[PDB]
């Protein structure tokens, strides 16, 4: 859409989201990091 608002949008929740996963992520890279 060429006519959308091309700016950051205020009036959004500025607080932490408590509806998040509190457990560890098993889908993470388990190998040593060469970089």
């Amino acid at each position, epitope marked *: 859409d*060429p*006519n*959308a*608002n*091309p*700016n*950051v949008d205020p009036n959004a929740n500025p607080n932490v989201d408590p509806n998040a996963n509190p457990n560890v992520d098993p889908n993470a890279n388990p190998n040593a990091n060469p970089n």
Partner: antibody
Amino acid sequence: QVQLVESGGGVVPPGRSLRLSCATSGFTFSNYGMHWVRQAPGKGLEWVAIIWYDGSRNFYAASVEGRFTISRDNSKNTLYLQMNSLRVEDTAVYYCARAAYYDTSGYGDYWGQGTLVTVSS
Amino acid sequence: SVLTQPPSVSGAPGQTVTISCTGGSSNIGAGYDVHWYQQLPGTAPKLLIYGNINRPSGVPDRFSGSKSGTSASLAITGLQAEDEADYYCQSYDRRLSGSWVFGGGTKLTVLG
């Protein structure tokens, strides 16, 4: 105060590239989108491109799509316009403008000084 | 140039002149706004009117404008010496892939 300064213009032969920039100061660069516009000598204005604040969305005019590339670096407060294979029809004074949206359409509240790009042989 | 403007307008100092901006059913008559810019001979365009009635702090009270149907106009009262400039009307066209579309541009002449 909003300060928009541009540089990188000059005289370039057709068929090759040239790069422009628009430095910004006096406002948070990351919270606003930016525009590129050009004005041919003796003509009116012609919109060129728009980039979103996060850089996700890029839009171009039909006459410049596929040749012009717009980019921004939020850590340097500088906007870039990469022009490749310039034609004689691309000789115009290029301005950068800060995007603003009122109800259903956009406008530019503050504009840059502008720079002139010459494409001739 | 989807927006059509007269090529040049003129009037005596201190009188009222109007700069029209004619569009179609896709740009002005489709429900979109019209913004105006004033370009001095030696500088970049400066914002004049946004929201079809609103002006920034820098713009004086003389400038005003309105829209109706597919037509929009800019009204100038009390022409002065420094009012000589090119005035462009900007909107958005539904039938293109660009955020802004500009008019031809009208040159205002003060017969001082």
